């Protein structure tokens, strides 16, 4: 996805493609209360003391 | 012990207690209908001032499939003996003073709950 997006502008690739592919998702204020949000993808998932290990989403 | 409402048989309405002065027994009459039935519990009302409610009775087995609930491996289940399990506080208002946890097994077809 990153490679296909970095070559945007030139061809036609945009955010709608990411939304359709199933990588991003719109979570509203009411639904944000029932998801395990994560801050960074790498730091909060490697392997350490078992905090939740059940992250569902991750902030940009 | 507690007391349950027992609806009428014809009109299906609330049955109020009645102390039979003649046979010296407890009856449940209907205001609209004239249905009568002999009591068996011999109780009418109970009040729980301390409100000693068992939080385990409110907890459901579906809490296990919670993505935003903590999990521990040091408190295995009893019946099935699975390792993974969840834990959380009462999660109910009016909590007098206690953060005692309520461990629930996280495994399908078990739904067991316990407390340590
Ligand atoms: Zn009746
Ligand atoms: Zn179990």
Curated annotation (Swiss-Prot), chain B:
Record has Transcription as a keyword: yes
Compartments, record wording: Nucleus, Nucleolus
GO molecular function, one term: zinc ion binding
Binding site for Zn(2+) 1: 8, 11, 30, 33
Superkingdom classification of source: Eukaryota
PROSITE patterns, A to Z: RNA_POL_M_15KD (PS01030), ZF_TFIIS_1 (PS00466), ZF_TFIIS_2 (PS51133)
InterPro entries: DNA-dir_RNA_pol-M_15_CS, Rpa12/Rpb9/Rpc10/TFS, Zn_ribbon_RPB9, Zn_ribbon_RPB9_C, Znf_TFIIS
GO cellular component: nucleolus; nucleus; RNA polymerase II, core complex
SMART domains in alphabetical order: RPOL9 (SM00661), ZnF_C2C2 (SM00440)
Record keywords, A-Z: Acetylation, DNA-directed RNA polymerase, Metal-binding, Nucleus, Transcription, Zinc, Zinc-finger
First and last residues of each zinc finger (C4-type): 8-33
Binding annotation for Zn(2+) 2: 77, 80, 105, 110
GO biological process assignments: maintenance of transcriptional fidelity during transcription elongation by RNA polymerase II; transcription by RNA polymerase II; transcription initiation at RNA polymerase II promoter; transcription-coupled nucleotide-excision repair
Principal subcellular localization: nucleus
Zn finger (TFIIS-type) start-end: 73-115
Subunit and partners: Component of the RNA polymerase II (Pol II) complex consisting of 12 subunits.
Similarity-based family: Belongs to the archaeal RpoM/eukaryotic RPA12/RPB9/RPC11 RNA polymerase family.
Role this protein plays: DNA-dependent RNA polymerase catalyzes the transcription of DNA into RNA using the four ribonucleoside triphosphates as substrates. Component of RNA polymerase II which synthesizes mRNA precursors and many functional non-coding RNAs. Pol II is the central component of the basal RNA polymerase II transcription machinery. It is composed of mobile elements that move relative to each other. RPB9 is part of the upper jaw surrounding the central large cleft and thought to grab the incoming DNA template.
Name listed for the protein in its UniProt record: DNA-directed RNA polymerase II subunit RPB9
């Amino acid at each position: 996805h990153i490679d296909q997006l970095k070559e945007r502008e030139y061809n036609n690739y945009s955010w709608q493609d990411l939304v359709a592919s199933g990588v991003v998702e719109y979570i509203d204020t009411l639904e944000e209360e029932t998801v395990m949000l994560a801050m960074t993808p790498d730091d909060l998932q490697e392997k350490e003391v078992a905090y939740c290990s059940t992250y569902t989403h991750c902030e940009i | 012990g507690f007391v349950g409402i027992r609806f009428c048989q014809e009109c299906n309405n609330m049955l109020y207690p009645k102390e039979d002065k003649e046979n010296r027994i407890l009856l449940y009459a209907c205001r609209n209908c004239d249905y009568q039935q002999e009591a068996d519990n011999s109780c009418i009302y109970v009040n729980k001032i301390t409100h000693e409610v068992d939080e385990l009775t409110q907890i459901i087995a579906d809490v296990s499939q919670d993505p935003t609930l903590p999990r521990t491996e040091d408190h295995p289940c009893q019946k099935c003996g699975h390792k993974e399990a969840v834990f959380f506080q009462s999660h109910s208002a009016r909590a007098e003073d206690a953060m005692r946890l309520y461990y629930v097994c996280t495994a399908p077809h078990c739904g067991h709950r316990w407390t340590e």
